[PDB]
Structures are given as C-alpha cells and as structure tokens.
Amino acid sequence: KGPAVGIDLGTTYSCVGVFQHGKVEIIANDQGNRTTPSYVAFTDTERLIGDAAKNQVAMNPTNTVFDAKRLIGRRFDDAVVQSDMKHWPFMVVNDAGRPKVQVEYKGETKSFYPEEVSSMVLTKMKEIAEAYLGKTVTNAVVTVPAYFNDSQRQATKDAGTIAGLNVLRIINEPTAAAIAYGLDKKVGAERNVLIFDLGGGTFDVSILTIEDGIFEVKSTAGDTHLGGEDFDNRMVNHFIAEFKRKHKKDISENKRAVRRLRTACERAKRTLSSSTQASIEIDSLYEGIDFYTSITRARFEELNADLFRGTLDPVEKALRDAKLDKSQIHDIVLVGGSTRIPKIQKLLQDFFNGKELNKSINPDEAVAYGAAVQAAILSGDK
Numbered sequence: 354k355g356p357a358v359g360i361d362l363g364t365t366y367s368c369v370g371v372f373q374h375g376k377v378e379i380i381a382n383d384q385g386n387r388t389t390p391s392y393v394a395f396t397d398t399e400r401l402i403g404d405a406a407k408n409q410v411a412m413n414p415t416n417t418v419f420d421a422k423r424l425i426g427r428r429f430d431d432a433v434v435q436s437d438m439k440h441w442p443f444m445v446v447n448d449a450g451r452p453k454v455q456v457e458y459k460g461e462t463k464s465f466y467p468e469e470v471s472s473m474v475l476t477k478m479k480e481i482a483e484a485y486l487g488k489t490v491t492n493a494v495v496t497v498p499a500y501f502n503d504s505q506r507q508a509t510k511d512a513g514t515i516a517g518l519n520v521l522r523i524i525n526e527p528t529a530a531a532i533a534y535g536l537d538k539k540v541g542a543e544r545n546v547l548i549f550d551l552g553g554g555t556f557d558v559s560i561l562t563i564e565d566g567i568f569e570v571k572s573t574a575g576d577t578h579l580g581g582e583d584f585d586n587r588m589v590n591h592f593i594a595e596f597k598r599k600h601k602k603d604i605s606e607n608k609r610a611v612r613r614l615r616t617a618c619e620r621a622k623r624t625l626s627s628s629t630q631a632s633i634e635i636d637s638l639y640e641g642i643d644f645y646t647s648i649t650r651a652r653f654e655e656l657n658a659d660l661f662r663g664t665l666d667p668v669e670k671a672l673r674d675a676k677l678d679k680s681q682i683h684d685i686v687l688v689g690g691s692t693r694i695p696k697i698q699k700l701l702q703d704f705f706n707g708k709e710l711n712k713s714i715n716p717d718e719a720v721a722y723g724a725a726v727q728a729a730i731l732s733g734d735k
C-alpha cells in the first residue's frame with residue numbers, strides 16, 4: 354500500500370507533498386521544479402500538462418488552458434465568469450448553464466468542464482508523487498480557498514475522483530499553512546494567526562483564531578485579481594517602452610514577442626528577490642533584433658510601488674472586520690510565491706511594527722506542506 358499525499362491545487366501553480374518518517378517531503382517534478390504550472394495544452398498530436406504546457410503557450414494560445422480554478426464549481430451566468438472570460442485566449446461556452454472550455458485537440462473540436470481540466474493537473478501531481486514514492490498514490494488531501502462555497506468544494510472533490518484520487522478531506526488553504534508551522538498544537542488559550550497569501554494571480558488575507566486545536570476563520574480579505582503576474586506585466590510595459598526607445602519599433606502587436614518578453618521578466622523577477630539586478634537576454638525578439646538589457650531591484654520596486662503598498666489595504670480591513678488590533682495577532686505566516694519579494698516582507702513587517710514573519714518554509718510550498726501533514730494524520734501514518 355502507499356502513503357496519502359497533500360496537494361495544493363493553485364490558480365497558477367500546484368504543489369505536492371508527502372509526510373514520511375516524521376518529515377514532510379515536497380516532491381519535485383520531471384523538470385526538477387517543486388511546484389508545477391496549472392496549465393493544460395492540446396495539440397495535433399498530444400495533450401501537454403504542467404511545464405510542457407506553459408512552455409508553449411505563445412505558440413498555441415487558443416488551445417492552452419489555465420485559470421480553471423476561477424471557473425470550477427461556478428455557473429456560466431456568473432458575473433465572475435462573464436468578466437474573467439473577457440481576458441482568456443481560450444474558448445469558454447455555456448452548456449445548460451455550466452461553463453465549458455472549448456479547445457481543438459487532434460483536429461477535432463472538444464470541450465471540457467472545469468473539473469476535468471483540474472483533474473488533468475491533479476493526475477500530473479499524482480504521477481509526480483508516484484514516480485518519487487515508487488508506489489501508487491490513492492488517498493489525498495486537497496486544499497481550497499477559505500471562501501469556496503459548497504459547489505466549488507464539490508467540483509474540486511470531483512476533479513479528484515475523476516483523477517483516480519480518493520479525497521480524504523478538503524481543507525482550507527490558510528488552515529493548511531497554519532498546520533505547516535505547527536500552530537495547531539494545543540497551548541492553552543486562543544491564538545490569532547494572520548495568513549498573508551500573495552500567489553501568482555490571487556491575494557488572500559485570512560485571520561484565523563485557534564483554540565483547543567479548532568480553527569475559526571475570523572475574517573478574510575484580499576483581491577482575486579492581484580498577483581505575481583501583475584508584477585510581471587509592469588516589467589513588460591516598462592521594457593516595451595524601452596525597446597521602442599532604442600529601436601523605434603513597437604512590439605505590442607506581436608503577441609509572440611510580448612509572451613517571450615513576459616517569460617523573461619518573470620524569471621528576472623525571481624532573481625531580483627535574491628539579487629540587486631538581473632539581465633534580460635532575448636535573441637531575435639522582434640524582426641531580427643536581439644533585446645539585451647537588465648533591471649535593478651530598485652527599478653523593479655519602483656515599477657510596482659503602488660501595487661506593493663496597496664497590499665496593506667486588505668490587511669487593515671481584515672483586522673477591523675475581525676475586530677482585532679495589530680498587537681493582538683500572535684503569528685504572521687507568509688504564503689504564496691510573491692511573498693519572497695524583499696519589499697513585500699519589509700512593508701508587512703513595518704506595518705506590524707517589526708514583528709517576526711514566519712517564512713522558513715518556502716511560501717509556495719506551505720499549503721502543500723500542511724496538507725501532507727494533515728493527510729498523514731487522517732491515514733494513521735501520524
């Protein structure tokens with residue numbers, strides 16, 4: 354038999370973890386990455402999932418699906434869906450009220466319910482675990498945002514079943530992050546924890562109260578359309594202007610030039626979280642012109658100043674709704690790949706008057722980490 358695993362099914366990135374020998378192991382994929390893009394792509398000859406999928410989006414924009422988490426368990430008539438679809442390069446049709454993604458696979462036109470797309474990503478995570486564990490993975494704990502209603506939770510459970518996973522339990526993402534740090538241990542009296550989650554495309558702030566081992570989501574806030582992608586876009590717009598300056602050519606119209614530039618920016622951004630400047634080396638970006646440049650962390654922070662700063666507004670609201678003061682929150686844990694940005698860390702710490710931030714576990718692996726632990730206890734492995 355095999356161990357149960359914990360899976361973070363994210364909007365942009367997903368992650369798998371497994372508790373074994375009192376330690377949690379975050380499993381890397383085929384490309385060696387510890388998190389894999391929640392991307393699925395359909396071509397003439399195959400269906401690509403994960404890195405392979407994202408690594409060809411600029412070439413196959415209408416048949417490469419992403420953001421399935423924004424659709425899952427929702428209706429077509431949903432104002433959310435209606436708004437979101439205005440920015441998706443892939444087709445989304447109404448099917449008796451339910452939204453469906455329409456793609457072209459092997460010449461034939463095919464459609465999928467959002468839960469089917471997510472099951473594909475889930476299958477990828479499962480095989481990643483299996484490759485590592487050297488055994489079949491059946492049981493799993495999958496995470497979901499705290500605000501997900503019954504339909505969304507149902508659809509997520511369904512995605513699991515059709516993926517061949519026996520979903521032991523669906524737990525909230527903030528709660529999984531708290532468990533990763535062991536903030537669920539009984540210490541007598543209440544503990545207020547603030548989960549600051551800034552991922553690839555969403556921002557969630559959750560204030561949890563934990564007494565006797567029971568979690569209570571006191572308040573939540575954030576922005577469904579604020580994430581690392583927005584930071585990348587600011588770099589893109591910055592570089593489009595620079596190319597136009599140096600070569601008097603506007604590459605905006607060329608969707609491929611822009612997507613290749615975005616991929617380069619996202620990578621330079623990650624480097625910036627550990628270095629003061631990074632170089633952008635793109636061969637033959639537009640026409641036959643190579644675009645060789647670099648950005649400094651200062652210029653980067655400067656391009657996103659208003660965005661970074663605005664991050665504190667949802668924090669303030671969460672506090673007031675929860676009826677607490679800065680001084681009353683006991684622990685602050687960082688979740689999401691974007692929390693690795695030094696400026697975001699400074700900004701939050703300054704706001705909480707120097708309080709220490711919980712960030713020893715990679716923020717983008719925190720949710721999976723907690724789910725893995727939770728899976729183990731539910732399986733008697735712990």
Ligand SMILES: Nc1ncnc2c1ncn2[C@@H]1O[C@H](COP(=O)(O)OP(=O)(O)NP(=O)(O)O)[C@@H](O)[C@H]1O
Pocket residue numbers: 363364365366367388551552553554555556580581582619622623624626688689690691692693694716717
């Ligand atoms: N070193 C880093 N510095 C800055 N951003 C990073 C770094 N490493 C990863 N990221 C970004 O973090 C995002 C990935 O976040 P992650 O939390 O893994 O996603 P997720 O849970 O799918 N997020 P969300 O889209 O909000 O649901 C992307 O915008 C990456 O560029």
Ligand SMILES: [Mg+2]
Pocket residue numbers: 363364550552689720
């Ligand atoms: Mg997330």
